Structure formats: C-alpha cells, structure tokens
Design a protein around this ligand. Structure first.
Ligand SMILES: *[C@H]1O[C@H](CO)[C@H](O)[C@H](O)[C@H]1O
Ligand SMILES: *[C@H]1O[C@H](CO)[C@H](O)[C@H](O)[C@H]1O
Ligand SMILES: *[C@H]1O[C@H](CO)[C@H](O)[C@H](O)[C@H]1O
Ligand SMILES: *[C@H]1O[C@H](CO)[C@H](O)[C@H](O)[C@H]1O
Ligand SMILES: *[C@H]1O[C@H](CO)[C@H](O)[C@H](O)[C@H]1O
Ligand SMILES: OC[C@@H]1O[C@@H](O)[C@H](O)[C@H]1O
Ligand SMILES: OC[C@@H]1O[C@@H](O)[C@H](O)[C@H]1O
Lengths: 49, 48
C-alpha cells in the first residue's frame, strides 16, 4: 500500500574458517564436514584434510 | 683226646656307610605372560 520496505537484516562481512578437525572442499557452502577415518585436519581453514 | 673244639663265631659285620642326599631342583619356570588390553572405542568428532 505505501510502497516502502521495512525489514532488512545484513549478512556476513567475513568468511568463517573451518575449525580444526573439519574441512570444506565446496566453494559456496554454509557448514564444515568432519573428515573421515585415516585423515586429519590440524589447521583452521583447510580445503581438504 | 679228640680234636679240641673251635672258637666262638664272630658277630655279624657292620653296614655300609649309607648314601648322600639328593641335589636340589632347578628354579621353577615363569608364569605365562599376560596379554595387553582392548583398544578403546572410536571417539566422536571434536567440537566445531
Ligand atoms: C667241640 O668240638 C670237638 C670236636 O668237634 C669235640 O667234639 C667237643 O666235644 C666239642 O665240644
Ligand atoms: C663260626 O666261627 C667259628 C670260628 O671261631 C667256628 O668256625 C664255628 O664253626 C662257626 O660257626
Ligand atoms: C665283619 O665284622 C665282624 C665282626 O663284627 C667279623 O669280624 C667279620 O669277619 C667281618 O667281616
Ligand atoms: C617349579 O619347578 C621346579 C623344577 O623346575 C620344581 O618342580 C618346583 O616344585 C616347581 O614349583
Ligand atoms: C595374550 O598375549 C600374551 C602375550 O603377552 C599371551 O600370548 C596370551 O596367550 C595371549 O592371550
Ligand atoms: O619346596 C618344595 C620341597 O622343598 C624344596 C624342594 O623343591 C621340595 O622337596
Ligand atoms: O636362574 C638361575 C639359573 O637360571 C637358569 C638355570 O637353570 C639356573 O641355574
């Protein structure tokens, strides 16, 4: 009726790195994967453990 | 006269000197070595 938008909530300013023990090989995603047996991830922000 | 008689026969001789004692046994064997324990279960993923 009044042609005015009201509710905006901003997104993220910086990307969170995957924690130790977790990895992420996909580009645009919203989570990390605990990586499988026989492998490990000892740094934060690993493309593949 | 006839032949004079003989002298009194002796008493029975003594025994041998009897044997020695047995040597001891060797130190007994060891006990069967025990076995290690079971590996713990697979742990879960650490906190994210
Ligand atoms: C001992 O022996 C002799 C002869 O053998 C004789 O007969 C004695 O009379 C006896 O005592
Ligand atoms: C035991 O010995 C004597 C010797 O002194 C005599 O020969 C006996 O006849 C015997 O029995
Ligand atoms: C063993 O000893 C006896 C006496 O005890 C006698 O002398 C035997 O002639 C001897 O062999
Ligand atoms: C242990 O072994 C030794 C001999 O090796 C002996 O038989 C002991 O009686 C036994 O306990
Ligand atoms: C467990 O291991 C020990 C070795 O220390 C031994 O072989 C046992 O027989 C086994 O059950
Ligand atoms: O200890 C047991 C007995 O004494 C020790 C010998 O092995 C046996 O005769
Ligand atoms: O342990 C003592 C010695 O060990 C080994 C022999 O049997 C014994 O004389």
């Amino acid at each position: 009726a009044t042609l005015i938008p009201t509710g905006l909530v901003k997104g993220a300013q910086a990307p969170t790195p995957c924690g130790m023990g977790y990895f992420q090989s996909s580009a645009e995603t919203t989570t990390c994967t605990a990586c499988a047996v026989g492998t490990y991830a000892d740094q934060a922000g690993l493309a593949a453990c | 006269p006839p032949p004079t008689s003989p002298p009194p026969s002796p008493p029975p001789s003594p025994p041998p000197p009897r044997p020695p004692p047995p040597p001891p046994p060797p130190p007994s064997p060891p006990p069967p070595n025990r076995s290690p324990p079971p590996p713990p279960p697979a742990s879960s993923a650490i906190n994210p």
